[PDB]
Amino acid sequence: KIRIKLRGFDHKTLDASAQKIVEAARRSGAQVSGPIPLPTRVRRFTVIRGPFKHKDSREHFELRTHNRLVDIINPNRKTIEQLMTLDLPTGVEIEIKTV
Amino acid sequence: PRSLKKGVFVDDHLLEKVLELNAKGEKRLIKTWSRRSTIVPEMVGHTIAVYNGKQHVPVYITENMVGHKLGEFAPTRTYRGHG
């Protein structure tokens, strides 16, 4: 019933955080569809290296927003009362939609 | 060309000067900068000096020159040939 999307830049912190949530939902009474690796949206940037002329050298930067889904079916109360007590990585955004 | 929904475009402040010159029956020279203005049949028979980036040049407006914009009659650059 409770569906958590996990979108962040760093995939270590992103992946870590999602383990802290697969276990949180275990020690509270529910079954869970695991942390599902949704595909990752890359934003590339292609700057000329030098300041003036010299177009024939660039440098390639990218920006990788990583995506993990997690579902907790059979959602109890002892579940929620262990979730609004977490928060442990900084560069990870959470959004919860009870759908 | 300009979309037909929005009619034609003339700068209100050129259209201004003419209506006063018409609704008083006076034919005194006008100067403007807005080349970009279309030519409504209201302008006909008048004389408008228009800017071409350097000066205002007179443009006597006859009938057949109505669909156009004023700028078409003051060229912007000066050409002779190559020597």
């Binding site: 292609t46 024939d56 050298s57 660039r58 | -």
Partner: protein
């Protein structure tokens, strides 16, 4: 009852399902020969069977997605060979000679900057 083998080739992925019988073959809900309507190369996809002599002793339910149809052909062609071995591990001996178990490592090369094409350098011409 079935025998599977997963054949991929260059952004193509083929799903081969083998079931003995007549000889007929479906790809993506169409007859093999209707899917590859006028493609000469197509016949090559069924070379893994012919070289063990099991063409006709089987059918095939196949699906492909990705790549061009030829890419799909060498992927099926792999996938069938991958499948003849889950069925008969002794078939390896017959297929590896002509190397029908080999995933073609070859694939489209990254366009590189300051080229027109990965290699195709821009033209230097005159002085």
């Amino acid at each position: 009852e079935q025998y599977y083998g997963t054949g991929r080739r260059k952004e193509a992925v083929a799903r081969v399902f083998l079931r003995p019988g007549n000889g007929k073959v479906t790809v993506n809900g169409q007859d093999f020969n209707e899917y590859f309507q006028g493609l000469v190369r197509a016949v090559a996809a069924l070379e893994p069977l012919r070289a063990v002599d099991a063409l006709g002793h089987f059918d095939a339910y196949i699906t492909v997605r990705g790549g061009g149809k030829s890419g799909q052909i060498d992927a099926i062609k792999l996938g069938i060979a991958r499948a003849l071995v889950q069925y008969n591990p002794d078939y390896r001996a017959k297929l590896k000679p002509l190397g029908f178990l080999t995933r073609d490592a070859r694939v489209v090369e990254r366009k590189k900057y300051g080229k027109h094409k990965a290699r195709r350098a821009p033209q230097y011409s005159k002085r």
